[PDB]
């Protein structure tokens, strides 16, 4: 009964559907009746060509604003170099119109799509905050294919206004269910960057999305970290296909690439999921992603099984998004219990790092208290430390269920002597584990240099609930 789109470039959208099994299983969600109708997605980027032949039919001025020039119209600024094409490419991935004889189709081709023009200018804390906090009772899902520089030396995250926007968004946005923030995990692969040094992706309030190539490999630009939640397809080498989407000047491109293309596809899949159950909270959505994402046919050297039997990789999170499985599970989903937060200050004295430091602590995770956690969601190791060359450090955190999260891998370009100032390294890899028991933090010098420093604070911050577990996978 379901008829797939007839758009001229839809056959080239290999990541949406195919018999090959290397796809995001989006046609199966369309066939269940979910195409995005009623859901509102906003692309936070360099603007959106609101009159594009493949976007006009879905464009939503209520999802749009121009923060750079302070006006309602997010139209890109046209230049000879087409610098401001990025947001329009992202928008088409989410919600390009279907069955209109133009280009291809969005994942959620009946969703409403807007854009915030906010990258074409100085991107201040206030600019980010006004973008993240735009019309939060109209916009359901925010997609951000941007962030701190991927030079492999930077440690940077949201400043005060932006962090307040995240908290206000997940607390009061979408009728109190919480804004959905989807983030691209980054393009710093060639610089050996770590997406845990990026406070936007590392945030518990964002769904950080990584990339896989068509042949199922870790792309050259990919950043590994423990905060990544899941993966969608994007570009790879020149024998692998790329992403088909709307381009600047009313054109169609078949060569959209990089981390930038993965977040919009995830945002589209989340739009389909919200259509299947509008009552999902921001935490519900992360649970659905954890439970339904698929490792199979993704190649990595670091796949590990966590304490509840789920495979997890620092390149891929829980694996490829599966749109059909997301919308199926969403329909009868029971809202998760309110989020508990258990704060455990680990150190009794500062500890010299030297060549290697191992800190073991047995915790009760707030046993006997209203914030008792037996079902982990996010875990953070908030670390304050000094060190003479930051990029020589590697940091690992082992859960009581034996799951070893790489909080920080060596970054050869990070020469900083600034250390970490209460930096909240986050891992998703122990999701649904019982956090009671022995946690182990390992800090090691990966170089032959006689480095030196001191760990002065280690706060283990656990988020989660105390009810509703599934039998382990």
């Amino acid at each position: 009964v379901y008829q797939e789109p007839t758009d001229p470039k839809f056959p080239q959208q290999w990541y949406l559907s195919g018999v090959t099994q290397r796809d995001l299983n989006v046609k199966a969600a369309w066939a269940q009746g979910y195409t995005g109708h009623g859901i509102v997605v906003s692309i936070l980027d360099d603007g959106i060509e609101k009159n594009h032949p493949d976007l006009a039919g879905n464009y939503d001025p209520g999802a749009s604003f121009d923060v750079n020039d302070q006006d309602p119209d997010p139209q890109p600024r046209y230049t000879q170099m087409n610098d401001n094409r990025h947001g329009t490419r992202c928008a088409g991935e989410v919600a390009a119109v279907a069955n209109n004889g133009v280009c291809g189709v969005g994942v959620a081709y009946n969703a409403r799509i807007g854009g915030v023009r906010m990258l074409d200018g100085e991107v201040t804390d206030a600019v980010e905050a006004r973008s993240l906090g735009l019309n939060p009772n109209h916009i359901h899902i925010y997609s951000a294919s941007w962030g701190p520089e991927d030079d492999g030396k930077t440690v940077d995250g949201p400043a005060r206004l932006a962090e307040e926007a995240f908290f206000r968004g997940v607390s009061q946005g979408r009728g109190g269910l919480g804004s959905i923030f989807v983030w691209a995990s980054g393009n710093g692969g060639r610089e050996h960057d770590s997406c845990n040094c990026d406070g936007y992706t590392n945030s518990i309030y964002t769904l950080s999305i990584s990339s896989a190539t068509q042949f199922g490999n870790v792309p050259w630009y990919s950043e590994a970290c423990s905060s990544t939640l899941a993966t969608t397809y994007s570009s790879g080498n020149q024998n692998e296909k790329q992403i088909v989407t709307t381009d600047l000047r009313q054109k169609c491109t078949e060569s959209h690439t990089g981390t930038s293309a993965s977040a919009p596809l995830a945002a589209g899949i989340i739009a389909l999921t919200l259509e299947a159950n509008k009552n999902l909270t921001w935490r519900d959505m992360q649970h659905l992603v954890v439970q339904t994402s698929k490792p199979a046919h993704l190649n990595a050297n670091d796949w590990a099984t966590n304490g509840v039997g789920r495979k997890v990789s620092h390149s891929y999170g829980y694996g490829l998004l599966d749109a059909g499985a997301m919308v199926a599970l969403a329909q009868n989903w029971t809202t998760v219990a309110p989020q508990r937060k258990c704060i455990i200050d680990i150190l009794t004295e500062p500890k010299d790092i030297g060549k290697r430091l191992e800190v073991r602590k047995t915790v009760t995770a707030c046993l006997g208290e209203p914030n008792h956690i037996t079902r982990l969601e996010h875990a953070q190791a908030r670390l304050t430390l000094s060190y003479n060359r930051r990029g020589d450090l590697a940091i690992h955190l082992v859960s009581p269920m034996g799951t070893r999260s790489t909080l920080l891998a060596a970054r050869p370009h990070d020469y900083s002597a600034d250390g970490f100032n209460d930096w909240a390294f986050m891992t998703t890899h122990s999701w649904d584990e019982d956090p009671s028991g022995e946690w182990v933090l390992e800090i090691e010098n990966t170089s032959e240099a006689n480095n030196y420093g001191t760990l002065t604070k280690f706060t283990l911050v656990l988020y989660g609930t105390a009810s509703g577990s599934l039998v382990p996978r």
């Binding site: 980027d45 990258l119 991107v123 941007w146 962030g147 701190p148 520089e149």
Partner: peptide, 4 residues
Amino acid sequence: XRVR
């Protein structure tokens, strides 16, 4: 910073 912030980059695309």
